[PDB]
Amino acid sequence: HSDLTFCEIILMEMESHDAAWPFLEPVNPRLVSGYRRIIKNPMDFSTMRHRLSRGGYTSSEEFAADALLVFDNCQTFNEDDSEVGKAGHIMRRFFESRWEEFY
Ligand SMILES: Cc1[nH]c(-c2csc(N=C(N)N)n2)c2c1C(=O)CCC2
Numbered sequence: 001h002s003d004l005t006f007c008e009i010i011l012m013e014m015e016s017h018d019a020a021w022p023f024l025e026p027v028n029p030r031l032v033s034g035y036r037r038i039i040k041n042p043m044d045f046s047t048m049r050h051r052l053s054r055g056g057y058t059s060s061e062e063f064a065a066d067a068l069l070v071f072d073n074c075q076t077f078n079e080d081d082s083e084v085g086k087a088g089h090i091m092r093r094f095f096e097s098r099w100e101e102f103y
Pocket residue numbers: 021022023027032073074077078084
């Protein structure tokens with residue numbers, strides 16, 4: 001239980017973060033040329049919230065795998081100096097920081 005209560009805290013804090021704006025909803029590939037071709041496993045915060053709401057996370061490491069996927073995808077598709085890239089570096093460092101001060 002205490003494994004997933006920490007996930008609720010960190011997801012809530014990511015959802016409300018100023019830099020979370022790129023990651024609150026699935027990328028719409030109709031709007032982003034090449035996204036479906038390049039990103040094989042899309043992930044975003046609303047999909048994590050939904051899976052957390054169903055309890056579809058066995059452990060905290062599965063939750064962290066999805067979170068890291070959000071930022072691996074971001075770094076794969078976006079230049080580090082792009083608007084989305086810069087936001088994902090902020091969010092990734094935030095996640096990494098909060099994660100290790102729980103484990
Ligand atoms: C993870 C991610 N979120 C968004 C996004 C949300 S809202 C918005 N609106 C713009 N850019 N005007 N872009 C993108 C993205 C990518 O990885 C590729 C480019 C677009």
